[PDB]
Design an enzyme around this catalytic site. Structure first.
Site, PDB file in Angstrom:
ATOM      1  N   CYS A   1       0.817  -1.209   0.000  1.00  0.00           N
ATOM      2  CA  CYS A   1       0.000   0.000   0.000  1.00  0.00           C
ATOM      3  C   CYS A   1       0.862   1.275   0.000  1.00  0.00           C
ATOM      4  CB  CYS A   1      -0.949  -0.021   1.205  1.00  0.00           C
ATOM      5  SG  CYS A   1      -1.953   1.487   1.218  1.00  0.00           S
TER       6      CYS A   1
ATOM      7  N   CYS B   1      -0.425   4.244   2.125  1.00  0.00           N
ATOM      8  CA  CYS B   1      -0.281   3.942   3.521  1.00  0.00           C
ATOM      9  C   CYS B   1       1.158   4.087   3.998  1.00  0.00           C
ATOM     10  CB  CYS B   1      -0.678   2.509   3.828  1.00  0.00           C
ATOM     11  SG  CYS B   1      -2.286   1.898   3.188  1.00  0.00           S
ATOM     12  N   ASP B   2       2.117   3.581   3.210  1.00  0.00           N
ATOM     13  CA  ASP B   2       3.495   3.560   3.649  1.00  0.00           C
ATOM     14  C   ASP B   2       4.447   4.626   3.101  1.00  0.00           C
ATOM     15  OD1 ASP B   2       3.058   1.345   5.394  1.00  0.00           O
ATOM     16  OD2 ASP B   2       3.325  -0.072   3.773  1.00  0.00           O
TER      17      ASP B   2
END
Ligand SMILES: NC(=O)c1ccc[n+]([C@@H]2O[C@H](COP(=O)([O-])OP(=O)(O)OC[C@H]3O[C@@H](n4cnc5c(N)ncnc54)[C@H](O)[C@@H]3O)[C@@H](O)[C@H]2O)c1
Ligand SMILES: NC(=O)c1ccc[n+]([C@@H]2O[C@H](COP(=O)([O-])OP(=O)(O)OC[C@H]3O[C@@H](n4cnc5c(N)ncnc54)[C@H](O)[C@@H]3O)[C@@H](O)[C@H]2O)c1
Lengths: 307, 306
Positions: A132, A135-136
């Site tokens: 992701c 997300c990261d």
């Protein structure tokens, strides 16, 4: 819970959307059953989650644990199994645990991530590999990274990573990308994104953490070893089109379960929430799945009480 | 920050929707400024929150603190002040000057309509509640009163009938204005008592709520009902004046009109939370926070494509 038992609502799935639905269902005093295969869903593949407001830098495994604790506070029975069919009250048939009855059903079945499957992928899980980008990305500030895939997920991934990271190698097996033009044009204007088209990943290498990705150009057969600190696998997702069709639930032309604003599907009494739905299509985050679950539980409550 | 400074996005408000938008805007690496009058928005009047998944039985004030901690982890500057106008965009505050931005996100919420009867403010947090879906589980086997006649009052009485021993549903008119379906459904409940053409004169008790004094407007009768809790569900005032003052289209109920992606009628201005037309009638922390993430995503898409 035992086969043949009747519930006001049966929630299918055990990811964020299902937990979100179960919390509201139970709090509405609806007799609720959750049947899902894997506790946490795609959270089982995440590392640190820092995009769910109020849970600061929580390990995904700890998020799954506290989400479960929250619904268990309300004594919601959870059955670990696969739902194979939903027949119309509704009869929900599972693979190993029998059939159960329900006045309403909430589908939180999500989507399955399309797998890559290259050497080093499992060995470096949690050590440089991410599924992701949004997300990261904050975790790879000033690191060199590679994004694999060519749909919207991959291009949007390269766009945000280009803001944080040193450079992004965007690797895709086809000659062109299939993402929306607006995304390809935006990414094309980033000086630190390099397109690596007509190529596939042969291996992910490293010591303790990821350090290189070996890539092959399908047209020339040429091999390249790229030095990267992170590999973002973004090849896409398969929606539950077959399950939906099998159970007489309408899907949109993208293959997702079609819902209205209130998470209602084409079948009265069946609602859906999360990644498997057509709402906020393409935005796949824990917060929105949990909120949709609350909405679907609310529509199920109105449906059951009125029935 | 300094007056005249420019941002990719300016978030108006400091309730759950604003905090949600701020977290995502900052995580999109957008230069972000939040300008809100009151930290926590309506959360300042809430008691214990147990409907936001993952934060079990958290005091509303503590949720406000962790939400603030979370966005401050991303160093988001927060100005406590009122936004007076939205004219790139020029956002004029009451005391901190003007600030410019490429996009704006409105998380201004709505004001709760107030009852204004004696004992109301005195017993807040001691038996009085403004949200049935939120606090009903706390009243299992107790007696409660719901004041109101719209959908929130009727559904609130219905949820409470599943927890409480008895529910008095008090409304000042001869009929309820809620969907007939809600009225018919609740009517069947053996433990719900309609108290129409009536108003509450006083809410009294000792350390906690013990009675509601009610006046019947037809029969003139004044009576006291013993109750353990009072749920006030009389609605909210939509953000229409601010919307019209800023050229933002509203829906037929006076709320800020948004599409699925929280886009308002003005290009580059998005909105989230209670103040929007999305999921109208369902006002919860989890949905506000999610709408804020969506609005922040739409703002990020707008700016990066601008
Ligand atoms: O994020 P999100 O919550 O939206 O999605 P998600 O993909 O994270 O989680 C959805 C969950 O539903 C479960 N699931 C999928 N199909 C199922 C079925 N037929 N029966 C039972 N469980 C099933 C999966 O184990 C999955 O983890
Ligand atoms: O739940 P939710 O988050 O949707 O709503 P909420 O009602 O809980 O919070 C809305 C926030 O907007 C703020 N606000 C309202 N109008 C404002 C203005 N013009 N300038 C600055 N702050 C303003 C309020 O102080 C409040 O904190």
């Amino acid at each position: 819970v035992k086969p043949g038992e009747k519930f006001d609502v049966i929630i299918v799935g055990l990811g964020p959307a299902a937990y979100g639905a179960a919390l509201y269902s139970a709090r509405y005093m609806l007799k609720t059953l959750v049947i899902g295969e894997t506790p946490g869903g795609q959270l089982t593949e995440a590392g640190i989650v820092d995009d769910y407001l109020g849970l600061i830098e929580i390990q995904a495994s700890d998020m799954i644990k506290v989400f479960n604790k929250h619904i268990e506070k309300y004594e919601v029975p959870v059955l670990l199994d696969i739902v194979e069919k939903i027949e119309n009250e509704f009869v929900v048939k599972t693979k190993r645990k029998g059939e159960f009855k329900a006045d309403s059903v909430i589908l939180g079945i999500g989507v399955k991530r399309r797998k890559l499957g290259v050497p080093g992928e499992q060995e470096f899980a949690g050590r440089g590999i991410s599924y992701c980008s949004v997300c990261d990305a904050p975790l790879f500030k000033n690191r060199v990274v590679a994004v694999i895939g060519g749909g919207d997920s991959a291009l949007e991934g390269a766009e945000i990573l280009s803001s944080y990271s040193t450079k992004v190698y965007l690797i895709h097996r086809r000659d062109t990308f299939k993402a929306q033009p607006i995304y390809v044009e935006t990414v094309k204007k980033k000086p630190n994104v390099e397109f690596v088209l007509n190529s596939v990943v042969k291996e992910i290498k490293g010591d303790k953490v990821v350090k290189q990705v070996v890539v092959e150009n399908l047209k020339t057969g040429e091999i390249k070893e790229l030095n990267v600190n992170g590999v973002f696998i973004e090849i896409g997702f398969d929606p539950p089109t077959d399950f939906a069709k099998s159970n007489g639930i309408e899907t949109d032309t993208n293959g997702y379960i079609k819902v209205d604003e209130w998470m209602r599907t084409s079948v009265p009494g069946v609602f859906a929430a999360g990644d498997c739905t057509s709402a906020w299509l393409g935005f796949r985050q824990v917060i929105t799945a949990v909120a949709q679950g609350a909405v679907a539980a609310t529509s199920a409550y109105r449906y059951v009480t009125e029935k």
